[PDB]
Amino acid sequence: GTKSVTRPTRSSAEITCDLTVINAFYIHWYLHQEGKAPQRLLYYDVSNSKDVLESGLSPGKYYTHTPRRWSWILILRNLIENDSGVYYCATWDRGNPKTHYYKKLFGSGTTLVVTDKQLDADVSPKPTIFLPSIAETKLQKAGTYLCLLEKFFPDVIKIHWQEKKSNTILGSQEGNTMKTNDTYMKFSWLTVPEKSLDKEHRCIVRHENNKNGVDQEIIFPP
Amino acid sequence: GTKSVTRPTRSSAEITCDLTVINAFYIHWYLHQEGKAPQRLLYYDVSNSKDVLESGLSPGKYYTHTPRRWSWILILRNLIENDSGVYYCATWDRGNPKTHYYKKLFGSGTTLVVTDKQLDADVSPKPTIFLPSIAETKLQKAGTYLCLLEKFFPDVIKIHWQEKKSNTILGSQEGNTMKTNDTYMKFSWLTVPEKSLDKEHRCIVRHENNKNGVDQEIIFPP
Amino acid sequence: QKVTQAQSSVSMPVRKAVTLNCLYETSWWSYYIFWYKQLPSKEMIFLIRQGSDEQNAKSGRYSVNFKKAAKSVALTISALQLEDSAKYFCALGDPGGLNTDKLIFGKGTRVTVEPRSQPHTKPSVFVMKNGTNVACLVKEFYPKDIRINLVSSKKITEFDPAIVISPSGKYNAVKLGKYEDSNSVTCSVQHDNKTVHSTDFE
Amino acid sequence: QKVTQAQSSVSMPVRKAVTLNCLYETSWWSYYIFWYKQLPSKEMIFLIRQGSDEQNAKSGRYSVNFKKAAKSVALTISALQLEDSAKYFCALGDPGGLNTDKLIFGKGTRVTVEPRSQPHTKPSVFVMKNGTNVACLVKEFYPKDIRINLVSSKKITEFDPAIVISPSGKYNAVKLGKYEDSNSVTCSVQHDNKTVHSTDFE
Amino acid sequence: QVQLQQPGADLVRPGTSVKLSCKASGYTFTSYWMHWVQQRPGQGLEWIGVIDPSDSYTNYNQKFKGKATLTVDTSSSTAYMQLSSLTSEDSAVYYCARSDDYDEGYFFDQWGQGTTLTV
Amino acid sequence: QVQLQQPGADLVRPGTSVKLSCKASGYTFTSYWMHWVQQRPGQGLEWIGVIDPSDSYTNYNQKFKGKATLTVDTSSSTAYMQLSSLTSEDSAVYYCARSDDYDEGYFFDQWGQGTTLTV
Amino acid sequence: DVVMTQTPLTLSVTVGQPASISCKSSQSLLHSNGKTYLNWLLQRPGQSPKLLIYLVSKVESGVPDRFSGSGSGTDFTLKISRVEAEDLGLYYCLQVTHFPLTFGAGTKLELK
Amino acid sequence: DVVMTQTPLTLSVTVGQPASISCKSSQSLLHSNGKTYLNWLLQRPGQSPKLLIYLVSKVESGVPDRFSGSGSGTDFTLKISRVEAEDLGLYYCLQVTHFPLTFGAGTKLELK
Ligand SMILES: *[C@@H]1O[C@H](CO)[C@@H](O[C@@H]2O[C@H](CO)[C@@H](O)[C@H](O)[C@H]2NC(C)=O)[C@H](O)[C@H]1NC(C)=O
Ligand SMILES: *[C@@H]1O[C@H](CO)[C@@H](O[C@@H]2O[C@H](CO)[C@@H](O)[C@H](O)[C@H]2NC(C)=O)[C@H](O)[C@H]1NC(C)=O
Ligand SMILES: *[C@@H]1O[C@H](CO)[C@@H](O)[C@H](O)[C@H]1NC(C)=O
Ligand SMILES: *[C@@H]1O[C@H](CO)[C@@H](O)[C@H](O)[C@H]1NC(C)=O
Ligand SMILES: *[C@@H]1O[C@H](CO)[C@@H](O)[C@H](O)[C@H]1NC(C)=O
Ligand SMILES: *[C@@H]1O[C@H](CO)[C@@H](O)[C@H](O)[C@H]1NC(C)=O
């Protein structure tokens, strides 16, 4: 359920709470920047429907929308560069057969990026796939596909290979994101045995700024 | 663009701003109850992104979400019976070839109803249409259809007749809403000349709690 | 500032003129007065704005009778149409140089436009039925005074008749009822001292 | 309260055990200490909670070395898998009887699991190309020390090689470059003092 | 002086739709209705219809309904009748007259010269 | 005392896949690898493969790759080899041996009795 | 509907003799507005008809004082105190309270 | 790949005479870990082989002190200070630093 949200300066941002808990009483929100410890920003009381901010924060900046029953959304105003990070929706758990109070259930986390977002062009990932080398299958008796993606601004990208149908999840090693100018680039590969080249493989890449608002799908030759 | 929003007590409600104005500077919100004068509740400054409440209102009750550029939404917490009414999104206009400052542009208005909404059953309108009387067309040479709707809780209902295609809008007299127990009932009629009975007519009823979340459509015999 | 509108319901014939009052008390030196119309579909539409320091402005069919020392402005609507049946709100506005300034509205009056004074017409009576529901239809009678009576034996529920204006300029009435004997009902209209039955046309 | 984690990056072989420190200063009488794991997909997963008044609790492969007067708790992970490469956060928690109580986290350490100490393996080198882009693939070499060199004439842009662990337990490397002469490139691997060329297998 | 005048006469073949006019001048053309009335040779008057020019609101006799259509040109201050399905019996003297507001006294103030429509 | 024993002998027809076992006892079966090595009659030893029971991580000789599959039953503390496509040349004495962690000294601590697989 | 009926439907009356013409209606002409409508119209042969009496009692301007109107309910009557040579022609009692706007049968005035 | 080579590949040595068996490798056996691996294994005919020398220099417990190991780089040598009747059999120098795990050709010990 991971996701990213990119917004310009002075705009407003929405961050969804992935918790499906029921009859909760408080909903805490945590910010995790880069290189810094996670820290709580606020906590929303649903018994009285009021959000309490940690000391040192300017009122009128956050909000905990509750569009439905047991569904929460954090709303940020006056976005500036510092607002970027990861946002977690968390809550304690009440009761147990053995009263441990063991954990604090944490959400899936949503990345937020704040940019200028006025000179930004279309930054959807553009795939430039690779074909297996015949010399490689000549002796090693295997094929190594390579799904290359380039020129995407939000680095939060999920690439996984599903062969032809979703039930066939194949382990695929993947390199780290590489920064090219203002955008980012990535590449993944998959090694398949002799009894795999008879099918078609897809590197189903999920990205926020992807075209059509849905995850892409790149068919490979057999 | 008129609409109605029904919500239970202690829930939260969203009211959309129908204004399509551009480069606005302030957005005022007006409440109009029944039997009482319209009164302004708050005004949102978009230059600094801050909503100012009229004196005498508890902070933490309203909010002016701005999900996109030039799109505003009012959010209400802790809904109680008194919160019902009509909400208008309004704004002054700046500049003119002759500096009149003539008007204050007003929105389409959205009705808000606050109920218990726990014992509420399915309250979508249920049509029980009527057929023209043969005796009526025997001498008067005309037909009078009658589209009856009954058992709907939100009284904000829009019934208009479109014949077969939307371009054919027919004037149709309509009776006032009648309260039956906890629900409401309505009926409309249309008189058509001799050169109209060869087609089919629809009483396209728009209602918030209508099934499938879209306006109904009732075909009539020729 | 405080704005009160005296009238609660006004009814006028078509092609005539009507006048709606608006009393108000203020404190500023220069102000403004606006008039707004609310349709049955809840749509506030601007009508006229009268400059306090200006003369009696006229805009289309709407005029304002304003005097600086009067502290009371009335709106005159000339040549009333049939779509002017609405709710009229009188709003007082602070100097519009700023953008925070709000309009303070009154309780608002209601305007209805009845058909012009017309000669009497005998209405035509018909009956429609689909299921236990029964509809009595009365067409083209000018005098509003009417008494639709449904004669049957097992009236379960009854609804007050709905009387509306027609595009022809006369009145159409429809009365809805719930009856077990759908085909055993009769309609009687006591209009203009004369009796009309539903079977007089069959 | 303030929690600091000394380590910034830790690397351990598979099937071994690792220990991560957590220093902290508090003021309350009774507290709690939790350990959380953040995957590369940004998912905080609960690992263990150690009762302050309780003994050294053990949960699965995770253990805590806690002493009441130590004011420092260390997490010992035994039998490291390959999916344990993550970011480990140490959190101090106020008495959980209330629901407003928050967890204060540290900067968090990072854990990486390299393949176990293995004998050397000669890697296999191949070249892929689609357009001006060129990919050099090196397979199944245990010693991380490697230097992939692409020999050509019109190198426009170059990317640092990506070296990853394989399901077989060894290393796979891929280097990507931009070359006008796509078919005129060669690959050289200087691994374990030995030289491997891409054409040695064709 | 208020004055309404009509074409003196008209001769058409049966089965042809005809158009009659009533030019009015010397008064507020809008504030008064316009009543068309027929007169068969050797018989009394018979009311045809009434047209209100301000709202263009028209009412017709039951017998003459559909046969006669009343229209108004407010720019030229004229009132026209369209006669359809002309036959032998549809020959008579047609008259246009001016009425009042029906609330402060109704009357036929003035009459034109009429037109003897013959088939 | 640490002890690994194997079936004494085995006789199968050519073309039939065979299964060999190496029962181990008297030590921590997990902490030490298991090396299978073949010995042709009248020739030196030839390494077949290695299996790590904790992670079940297996490596095979290039020549014997595919022919021999190594598996482990940790519950019963056993190590098995599957031999495929048996032919005339695939008859030899097969041995299982115990190794160490490769970081503090590698060696072949103990050996079984072996099994003389004949086709 | 509403139909008028003129009783004498002819009157050969010499000069100087007052005369009365009565007409009756099937239904009352008292409008719900608060007035009754009955127009006594005079048609001189060869020219357009001219209105003599409106609103039953009142008289159109430019008309001699001899003409008068009376009646109520469903029966009305026009009276001519003095009959002259210019009163000859036709007379109609016209009812406008009901929309069909029925005209009277017609009373012809003659001389002996 | 890596292949070992045993030089004498036979040794008919009488009792009491020290002997040396040398074996060489195509590539250096110095592991990047920081150790070199070369196991001197003794196979007594009729039974399973037993490990004599591990890590080139060290000696497995339960083995007489006569056996010793030396060498470095790509060349190593096992030494027997005193040759007895229980040393007869076969000897292998085994290299484990490279995964193919190549075995030696085999040195047969005999007597005159
Ligand atoms: C090299 O990359 C190009 C660009 O993606 C590949 O062309 C695609 O081929 C697939 C084959 O199924 C088509 O569906 C796509 O529409 C093509 N994309 C284009 C033309 O932009 C090409 O196949 C790659 N070469 C390989 C894999 O050998
Ligand atoms: C009386 O009302 C019923 C109930 O709506 C009408 O039945 C509908 O008939 C239309 C004909 O096109 C069907 O499409 C609908 O599905 C029917 N609705 C039902 C069965 O619930 C019936 O037509 C009406 N009688 C008339 C108009 O004479
Ligand atoms: C960025 O793009 C510019 C375009 O002029 C190019 O010169 C430069 O080399 C690029 N830099 C990188 C790091 O890709
Ligand atoms: C409301 O429903 C109840 C059901 O028992 C019925 O008795 C009653 O008459 C209904 N009232 C109205 C006003 O419809
Ligand atoms: C009015 O109704 C009464 C009922 O008794 C009847 O006598 C009278 O004639 C009616 N009048 C008209 C004008 O229909
Ligand atoms: C190491 O590389 C050098 C390069 O000069 C070469 O001389 C030497 O033989 C190499 N050693 C091995 C073991 O490959």
E strand residue ranges, chain B: 3-7, 13-16, 26-32, 39-45, 50-53, 64-68, 71-76, 85-92, 104-106, 110-114, 126-127, 143-152, 157-161, 178-180, 183-192, 203-207
Distance B180 CA to ligand 4 centre (A): 8
| D abuts H (3+ Cβ pairs < 8 Å) | yes
User: How does DSSP assign C92-120, residue by residue?
Assistant: EE--TTSSS--EEE---EEEEEEPPS--B
Work out the angle at residue D92's Cα, subtended by the Cα atoms of residues D89 and D96, and round it to the nearest 5 degrees. 125
Would the CB atoms of C169 and E103 count as touching at under 8 Å? no
CATH number of E3-99: 2.60.40.10
Q: B140-165: buried (b, 16+ CB within 10 Å) or exposed (e) per residue?
A: beebbbbbbbbbbbbbbbebbbbbee
Q: Which amino acid is at H22?
A: S
Nearest to A152 by CA among A171, A192, A125: A125
Please list every residue in chain A whose beta carbon sits closer than 8 Å to the beta carbon of residue D126: 133, 135-136, 144
Give, using CA atoms, the residue closest to atom 4 of ligand 6. Answer: D193
Q: E57-60 and H67-72: which strand pairing?
A: unpaired
What DSSP element (H or E) covers E81? Answer: strand E78-83
Ligand 6 probe mutation, H24, H25, H26, H28, most atoms within 8 A of CB: H28
Which ligand 5 atom minimizes the distance to the CA of G26? Answer: 13
Distance D101 CA to ligand 3 centre (A): 49
CB E61 within 8 A of CB G100: yes
- DSSP 8-state code for residue B219: B
For chain G, which chains pass the contact test of at least 3 CB pairs under 8 Å?
A: C, E
The answer to whether residue C40 sits within a structural domain is yes
Ligand 3 pocket, Cβ-based, cut-off 6 angstroms? A 180-181
State how far the Cα of A195 lies from the Cα of A3, in Å rounded to an integer. 35
Q: Which amino acid is at B95?
A: G
Q: Is any atom of ligand 2 closer than 6 Å to the C-beta of B204?
A: no
CB-count burial class (<10 Å; 0-12, 13-18, 19+) for F12: middle
Regarding whether C105 and C10 lie in a shared domain, the answer is yes
What DSSP element (H or E) covers E39? Answer: strand E34-39
Name the residue with tokens 């203002």. Answer: A182
CB B146 within 8 A of CB B221: no
CB E95 within 8 A of CB G48: yes
Ligand 6 probe mutation, H1, H2, H27, H98, most atoms within 8 A of CB: H27
E strand residue ranges, chain F: 3-5, 9-11, 18-25, 34-39, 45-52, 57-60, 68-73, 78-83, 92-98, 115-118
State how far the Cα of D5 lies from the Cα of D48, in Å rounded to an integer. 17
CA distances from G31 to B53, G34, G36, G95 (A): 59, 6, 6, 11
The answer to whether residue D163 sits within a structural domain is yes
Phi then psi for residue A137, to 5 deg, are -75, -10
For C119, which of G27, G28, G98 is closest by C-beta distance?
A: G98
Give the CATH number, domain containing residue C68: 2.60.40.10
Nearest to C109 by CA among C144, C77, C69, C145: C77
CA distances from F106 to D144, D149, F32 (A): 21, 34, 10
CB E119 within 8 A of CB E88: yes
Pick left, alpha or beta for residue G106 (phi over 0 → left; psi -120 to 50 → alpha; otherwise beta). left
CB B66 within 8 A of CB B27: no
Q: How was this structure determined?
A: cryo-EM
Please list every residue in chain C whose beta carbon sits closer than 8 Å to the beta carbon of residue E57: 116, 169
E strand residue ranges, chain A: 3-7, 13-16, 26-32, 39-45, 50-53, 64-68, 71-76, 85-92, 104-106, 110-114, 126-127, 143-152, 157-161, 178-180, 183-192, 203-207
- The C-alpha of C195 sits at a distance from chain E's nearest C-alpha, in angstroms, of 21
CB-count burial class (<10 Å; 0-12, 13-18, 19+) for C11: exposed
CB D175 within 8 A of CB D148: yes
Among residues D114, D145, D178, the one where a domain terminates is: D114
Q: Is any atom of ligand 4 closer than 6 Å to the C-beta of B176?
A: no
The answer to whether residue C186 sits within a structural domain is yes
Give the CATH number, domain containing residue G18: 2.60.40.10
CB F72 within 8 A of CB F53: yes
Q: CA dihedral in degrees (F25, F26, F28, F32; nearest 10)?
A: -70
CB G96 within 8 A of CB C119: yes
Query: Which pair of tokens denotes residue C8?
Result: 């609660």
Phi then psi for residue A186, to 5 deg, are -150, 160
Regarding whether C143 and C81 lie in a shared domain, the answer is no
CB B43 within 8 A of CB B52: yes
CA distances from H33 to A83, F119, H102 (A): 46, 42, 19
E strand residue ranges, chain D: 2-4, 10-13, 18-20, 23-25, 32-38, 44-51, 58-59, 62-65, 74-77, 86-93, 103-105, 109-114, 124-130, 133-141, 148-151, 155-158, 162-165, 171-179, 186-191, 194-197
Test the D interface: residue of F29, F32, F47, F59 with most D CBs within 10 Å = F59
Nearest to A108 by CA among A22, A24, A30: A30
CB-count burial class (<10 Å; 0-12, 13-18, 19+) for C153: exposed
Test the C interface: residue of E47, E55, E58, E70 with most C CBs within 10 Å = E55
Among residues C96, C114, C132, the one where a domain terminates is: C114
The answer to whether residue H49 sits within a structural domain is yes
Nearest to B46 by CA among B2, B104, B89, B108: B89
This structure's resolution (Å) is 3.5
For D162, which of A40, A43, A176 is closest by C-beta distance?
A: A176
State how far the Cα of D173 lies from the Cα of D189, in Å rounded to an integer. 11
Q: C10-13 and C109-114: which strand pairing?
A: parallel
- The C-alpha of B200 sits at a distance from chain C's nearest C-alpha, in angstroms, of 18
CB B78 within 8 A of CB B11: no
For E44, which of G96, G100, G106 is closest by C-beta distance?
A: G106
Q: What is the CATH architecture of B3-114?
A: Sandwich (2.60)
CB C88 within 8 A of CB C109: yes
Q: How remote is the C-alpha of D61 from its chain's centroid? A: 18
The answer to whether residue D119 sits within a structural domain is no
State how far the Cα of E51 lies from the Cα of E29, in Å rounded to an integer. 12
Domain limits for position H32: 4-107
- DSSP 8-state code for residue B134: H
Domain limits for position D140: 124-200
Among residues D92, D114, D136, the one where a domain terminates is: D114
Residues on A contacting B at a C-beta cutoff of 8 Å: 10-12, 14, 49-50, 60, 63, 65-67, 69, 75, 77-78
The answer to whether residue C119 sits within a structural domain is no
Query: Which pair of tokens denotes residue F61?
Result: 């000789």
Distance B125 CA to ligand 4 centre (A): 18
Q: Is any atom of ligand 5 closer than 6 Å to the C-beta of G27?
A: yes
What total number of domains does chain D contain?
Answer: 2
Nearest to A42 by CA among A27, A20, A23, A60: A27
CATH number of B126-213: 2.60.40.10
Distance B148 CA to ligand 4 centre (A): 19
Taking the alpha carbons at both ends of chain D, their separation in whole angstroms is 64
State how far the Cα of C163 lies from the Cα of B186, in Å rounded to an integer. 14
The answer to whether residue D103 sits within a structural domain is yes
Pick left, alpha or beta for residue E75 (phi over 0 → left; psi -120 to 50 → alpha; otherwise beta). alpha
Ligand with minimal distance to D191 CA: 6
CB-count burial class (<10 Å; 0-12, 13-18, 19+) for D134: buried
Query: Which pair of tokens denotes residue B55?
Result: 């004196």
The answer to whether residue C138 sits within a structural domain is yes
Nearest to B74 by CA among B93, B89, B92: B89
3-state secondary structure at position B211: helix
Ligand with minimal distance to D194 CA: 6
Please list every residue in chain D whose beta carbon sits closer than 8 Å to the beta carbon of residue F55: 14-15
Regarding whether D107 and D51 lie in a shared domain, the answer is yes
What DSSP element (H or E) covers B139? Answer: helix B134-139
Residues of chain A with CATH 2.60.40.10: 3-114, 126-213
The top-level CATH class assigned to F3-102 is mainly beta
State how far the Cα of B148 lies from the Cα of A84, in Å rounded to an integer. 56
Q: How remote is the C-alpha of B48 from its chain's centroid? A: 32
Up-side HSE of residue A27: CA atoms within 13 Å toward CB? 29
Q: How remote is the C-alpha of B145 from its chain's centroid? A: 25
Q: Is any atom of ligand 2 closer than 6 Å to the C-beta of B219?
A: yes
Q: CA dihedral in degrees (A197, A202, A203, A206; nearest 10)?
A: -170
Q: D5-33: buried (b, 16+ CB within 10 Å) or exposed (e) per residue?
A: bebeeeebbbbbebebbbbbebeeeebbb
Q: Is any atom of ligand 1 closer than 6 Å to the C-beta of A146?
A: no
Q: F22-54: buried (b, 16+ CB within 10 Å) or exposed (e) per residue?
A: bebeebebeebbbbbbbbeeeebbbbbbbbbbb
**Residue B218: Cβ within 10 Å count:** 19
- Please give, one letter per residue, the 3-state secondary structure of A31-55: EECCCCCCEEEEEEECCCCEEEECC
Distance A129 CA to ligand 1 centre (A): 7
State how far the Cα of B174 lies from the Cα of B146, in Å rounded to an integer. 10
- β-partners of residue H30 are H36
What total number of domains does chain G contain?
Answer: 1
What DSSP element (H or E) covers A135? Answer: helix A134-139
Phi then psi for residue E39, to 5 deg, are -145, 110
For chain E, which chains pass the contact test of at least 3 CB pairs under 8 Å?
A: C, G
Query: Which pair of tokens denotes residue G55?
Result: 């609103």
Please list every residue in chain C whose beta carbon sits closer than 8 Å to the beta carbon of residue B111: 42
Considering only residues 113 to 142 of chain D, which have any Cβ-Cβ distance to chain H shorter than 8 Å? 117-122, 142
- Cβ-proximal residues to G67 (8 Å cutoff; 6+ apart), any chain: G40, G52, G53, G59, G78, G79, G80
Would the CB atoms of F44 and H99 count as touching at under 8 Å? no
CB H100 within 8 A of CB H94: no
Nearest to G101 by CA among G52, G37, G46, G57: G37
3-state secondary structure at position C182: helix
State how far the Cα of D191 lies from the Cα of D148, in Å rounded to an integer. 9
For chain C, which chains pass the contact test of at least 3 CB pairs under 8 Å?
A: B, E, G
Nearest to C123 by CA among C186, C196, C193, C202: C196
Please list every residue in chain D whose beta carbon sits closer than 8 Å to the beta carbon of residue F57: 116, 169
Contacts 24+ apart (CB under 8 A), E24-28: E24/E77, E24/E78, E24/E79, E24/E96, E24/E98, E25/E77, E26/E1, E26/E2, E27/E2, E27/E98
State how far the Cα of B48 lies from the Cα of A113, in Å rounded to an integer. 21
Would the CB atoms of B133 and C162 count as touching at under 8 Å? no
